Amino acid sequence: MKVELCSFSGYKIYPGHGRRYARTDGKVFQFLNAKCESAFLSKRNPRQINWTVLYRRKHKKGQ
Amino acid sequence: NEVVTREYTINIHKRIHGVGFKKRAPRALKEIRKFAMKEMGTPDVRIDTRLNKAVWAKGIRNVPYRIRVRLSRKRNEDEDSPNKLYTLVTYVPVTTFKNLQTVNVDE
């Protein structure tokens, strides 16, 4: 089975982990855990959350 | 070597885990006194009032997690007392608890 990526944090979700979310507009999202899901549903921008892949990429933390 | 002194770190966090708020600090003292008897084998355990003040320094429920103490086994000058020896538990202020071992103190 292929491995998805959390639509909020960018971590990869192995089979049997997290949840899948389907919005009424047709977009579908995956979440690693309820922490990532909670941030996404409260409309938090992942680029301001220090522990997300989008944040570290934006601030060149790994690089 | 009846008269000995050692320095210990007492992990109060795991000793008082699950205890009710109004009993948390009192049970830290009871666990410190239980700890001293185990390490020195002296039913006569005396806890310094400064160590009492350190265990209560944050209130009845938010007790400090770790605490560095010093145990000194001394001779009981009270010939009437049934216990020849007794342990004195004093307080050691420390900035950090990392890498602190059980240390023999030589007077």
Partner: protein, 131 residues
């Protein structure tokens, strides 16, 4: 041939779900569920792919004050799939049908669960997307 699997039921009797077709109905009020034998004190419940008996509470005057057969297509209660995926939707939706399972409308708004799309070919062909 291949039969559907048990999924969590999110819509007991009394649940008011959206109407995701173009009949005119705005929401569907679930009064019963097909196939429920049940037991004492237990409400009949429905999940994606289940046919139910519903009334229209908000909608065209002609669709109200009568019982229609509806089919659930989305649910807000997450259900496990055999690949281990827990899926849920932003809202609970359904479409009016007849006893044969054919849609009373011609278009659906929003996605449709794969559980329901497989079970109802006539609903599936009208689905814009399948989740």
């Amino acid at each position: 041939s291949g039969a559907k699997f048990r999924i969590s039921l999110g819509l007991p009797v009394g649940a008011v779900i959206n109407c995701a077709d173009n009949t005119g109905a705005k929401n569907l009020y679930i009064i019963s569920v097909k196939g429920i034998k049940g037991r004492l004190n237990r409400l009949p419940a429905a999940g994606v792919g289940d046919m139910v008996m519903a009334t229209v509470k908000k909608g065209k005057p002609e669709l109200r004050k009568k019982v229609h057969p509806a089919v659930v297509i989305r649910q807000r209660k997450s259900y496990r799939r055999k690949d281990g995926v827990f899926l849920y939707f932003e809202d609970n939706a359904g479409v009016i049908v007849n006893n044969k399972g054919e849609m009373k409308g011609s278009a659906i708004t929003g996605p449709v669960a794969k559980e329901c799309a497989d079970l109802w070919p006539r609903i599936a062909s009208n689905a814009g997307s399948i989740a």
